[PDB]
Design a protein around this nucleic acid. Sequence first.
RNA 1: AAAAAA
RNA 2: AAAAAA
RNA 3: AAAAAA
RNA 4: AAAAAA
RNA 5: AAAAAA
Lengths: 52, 381, 381
Amino acid sequence: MVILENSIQNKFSAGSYPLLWSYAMGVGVELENSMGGLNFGRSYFDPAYFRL
Amino acid sequence: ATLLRSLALFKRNKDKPPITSGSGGAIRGIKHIIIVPIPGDSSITTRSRLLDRLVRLIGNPDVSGPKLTGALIGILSLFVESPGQLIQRITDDPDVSIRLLEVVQSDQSQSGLTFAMEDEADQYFSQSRFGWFENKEISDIEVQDPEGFNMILGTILAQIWVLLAKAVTAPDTAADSELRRWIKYTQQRRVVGEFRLERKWLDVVRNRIAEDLSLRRFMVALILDIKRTPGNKPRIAEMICDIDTYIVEAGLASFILTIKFGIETMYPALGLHEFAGELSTLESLMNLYQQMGETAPYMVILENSIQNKFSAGSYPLLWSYAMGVGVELENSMGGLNFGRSYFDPAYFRLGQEMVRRSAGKVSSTLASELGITAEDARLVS
Amino acid sequence: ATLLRSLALFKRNKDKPPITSGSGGAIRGIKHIIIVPIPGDSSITTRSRLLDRLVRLIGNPDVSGPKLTGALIGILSLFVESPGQLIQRITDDPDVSIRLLEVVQSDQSQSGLTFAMEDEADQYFSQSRFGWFENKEISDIEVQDPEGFNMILGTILAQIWVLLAKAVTAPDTAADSELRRWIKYTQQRRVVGEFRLERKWLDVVRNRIAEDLSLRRFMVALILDIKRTPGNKPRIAEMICDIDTYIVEAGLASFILTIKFGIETMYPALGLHEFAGELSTLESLMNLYQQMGETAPYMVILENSIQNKFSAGSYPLLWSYAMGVGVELENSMGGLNFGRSYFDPAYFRLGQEMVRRSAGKVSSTLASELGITAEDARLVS
RNA sequence: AAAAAA
RNA sequence: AAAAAA
RNA sequence: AAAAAA
RNA sequence: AAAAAA
RNA sequence: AAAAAA
């Protein structure tokens, strides 16, 4: 849906769940040596949750 | 016991919209004609030159009211083949009769377009006050290849459809935000980056969309027609149905938000009796929001009669509570203006403190779902 | 009876840190960009030449503030593969946005490095005032074998991480002490002995680490990331986690020391009522010291807000007592400066005399542990 | 804020 | 209302 | 929009 | 009526 | 009969 640029890849965007996204950003940095290379920088990032 | 069943039926018909049987043609608006220039032929050269003349048509101060309305409807439908059939499909408006004149290119005319009539045409289509693209190295956008037209058309329409998101709610505030969506479509390579219109051009459109109702009815009701297209859409429609997510509930953010933070978080300060009735008001508006159908999220773009019913004044305490919850839980909602005559700040700080007291305080209505022990709940605190 | 239980809960929430629920993006610092040059490629030749240019970059007077900050962060992360992923992992700072530019080697450049841009690069990287290695027979450290780089990198980093131990507490006094740690790593054959930097080079770094906070937050928070590495560390990380023992509680020596000599020695001059409340203040700060977590020993490197709470002014009598005990029991603590406006020398000499009176005076709270007789206690006296 | 710590 | 608190 | 995946 | 949302 | 309600 994001290769095709579908209209409802805005709906799976992390802005509708920005706290639970940041939490799962916080979990996945330690549990992957790969996800350390993931860029995740958005205007809704909420780093308080990320360190929780 | 039988009081509460009588109470529940009493509250749901109070919110229930009156069933619209109809007055049989009794109440009909006086119709004013709106001059909509639609390209005469399918060929790209005509579409391109009409898009060139309509873009600079809008910028000048001289253009009147419905001349600016028809020029906007003239370019909001250039992306389809046969734009004339698109307009008559959409206009269910009582206040507006669209008369739409075909426009063919010409050799002898000063503008280069005639009406299918050479001097009446340039009288329709025609230096600091003229609005144009913000880099003045570009004078004419007339192109020949159709994908060069289809990219220069979406570059214009993605700067007009983003205005509808914040035209009735925050015109003054809006210019900060539609540059973020412009970065979104430039980095997605949806739009061409050098063709950004002036803010002076967009302030003519934005103060037009805010002013008249007949343009907002057209712009909403074609989005609802873009959404219904079954297959993969054409690439302008798949962009207009991308901007619409910024227009869906554009102005119900005292109701969508309250539900998101008041109802859904389920802090223990909903078993207050002070809220026990304003949940039942708010459970009817949730049932009413699909009773209104698919035109429900646009009820404040369209200025519908029952966006007074989703106003926060009918539940002013449970609104203020969900204002108190949502200030801490969003770094975005700190920028939300919420100032009303029914604000009740006593409740707002009761809703602020429920976020702060239950910081590391894993619930009881979701711990049985997982199996959280007292060993595990202390680790979160 | 019920007064003392109310008193114990009153004192522990007075020391208890306020639970940080958060202001939802309300208080955000204005971010200044810091130019961090990170090597473009994994190959040793680039790492070596960038280390060569960043070492002499620091010495010159011309370098500004954050240019010196990014050059230090540029070499404090050269020991990892992919230094770019290390920086973004660590910087949780609100005041600083790290933009980090990759640096690749070149044939045509004057410095020998370009940015992945050949004149902007040497404008970034470029005689008595220049700081360098103290033996001027060495001009260029560029090496090719990677263990010759890994030894010349640890020789530089073991002279920068030792500065953090005594940068905020004793900058003037410090130069006497980091030569002792330099002897420690030279005799352990951790560092290369001939590559000792000037004191003039180190005074640029030490007066930088003392000045800005954003460099001390990076240096602490990567040490806390070095410490978490599960297996055997890389040999620079196992050296950075060797220097950190000199940084753990680097400035809480009015609290760590008081506990060591006041509380732990358990002389009979703790049953004074003059101390009976300042034990209860100090038993909360011991419980608070793991409530702060693993960032507790660095609370005065980081200039945390609650290193005022571990200050000796809240227990000024029991501090002075443990100053009196620790002067005789250490030939090292005679060099400790302890001069404050709350010193109370009456107590200090009461704590000096408890060491002197009970010289050969084996206790009663540890004699029952062993079974010391009056025959045996006279032999110690 | 201050010492010492292979 | 009063002091001291890197 | 971002990572990794015989 | 107000915020944010690849 | 009384208020408030984009």
